[PDB]
């Protein structure tokens, strides 16, 4: 398993090295999104939490298509503010409940070291 702690001060740095295969080895959920909210990466652990099939959601829009319960000021609101701003680093609790058993999680969003992309990291609380 890949040894990275949820909420770590340098997380963008550590995941920078990591291929889709290395992302699957994390203890928590990880999704890589572009600036428009399209899914670029989606790990096994996020899969175990939500029930989505990872390979199948890559290419879809997280806010419109996959996860419309996050299309809210308290989630997407903050995302788009971070993208406009070019800086983003926030952690909050949320409940995921679209076509699934409602599941409370801790959500951490952060700008990646790349370019114009963004991470969403998820764990159970």
């Amino acid at each position: 398993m890949e040894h990275v702690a949820f909420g770590s001060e340098d997380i963008e740095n550590t995941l920078a090295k990591m291929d889709d295969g290395q992302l699957d080895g994390l203890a928590f959920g990880a999704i890589q999104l572009d600036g428009d909210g399209n899914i670029l990466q989606y790990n096994a652990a996020e899969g175990d939490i939500t029930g989505r099939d990872p390979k199948q959601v890559i290419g879809k829009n997280f806010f419109k298509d996959v996860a419309p319960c996050t299309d809210s000021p308290e989630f997407y609101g903050k995302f788009k503010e971070g993208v406009a701003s070019g800086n983003l680093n926030t952690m909050f609790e949320y409940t995921f409940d679209y076509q699934m058993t409602p599941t409370k999680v801790k959500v951490h969003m952060k700008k990646a070291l790349s370019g114009d992309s963004y991470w969403v990291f998820v764990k159970r609380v």
Side-chain angles (χ1 to χ4, degrees):
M1 96 150 170
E2 302 295 0
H3 44 291
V4 86
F6 186 90
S8 285
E9 81 161 358
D10 307 290
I11 196 155
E12 70 258 50
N13 297 65
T14 312
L15 307 208
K17 38 153 192 215
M18 283 194 191
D19 93 296
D20 64 34
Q22 272 195 92
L23 234 51
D24 278 347
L26 301 167
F28 46 97
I31 313 166
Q32 207 189 198
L33 261 61
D34 76 15
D36 291 291
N38 301 306
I39 298 171
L40 302 178
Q41 306 187 96
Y42 198 104
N43 84 339
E46 184 66 9
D48 293 339
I49 292 169
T50 69
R52 282 68 170 164
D53 191 296
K55 251 43 145 81
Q56 290 195 38
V57 290
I58 299 161
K60 309 202 163 161
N61 193 286
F62 182 74
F63 301 104
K64 167 180 196 201
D65 291 329
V66 176
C69 88
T70 67
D71 176 1
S72 79
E74 300 171 42
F75 198 131
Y76 183 29
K78 298 184 169 143
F79 178 78
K80 67 103 146 165
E81 291 173 53
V83 178
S85 264
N87 136 91
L88 179 59
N89 198 331
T90 183
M91 181 174 313
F92 56 96
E93 297 185 357
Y94 216 75
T95 298
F96 288 169
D97 64 357
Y98 187 56
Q99 305 184 143
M100 67 189 289
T101 305
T103 295
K104 192 160 262 121
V105 294
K106 196 178 302 200
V107 176
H108 173 208
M109 310 191 284
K110 190 157 204 200
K111 180 184 171 56
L113 206 143
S114 103
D116 234 53
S117 65
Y118 307 79
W119 299 103
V120 175
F121 307 114
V122 185
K123 79 169 174 154
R124 295 178 200 258
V125 291

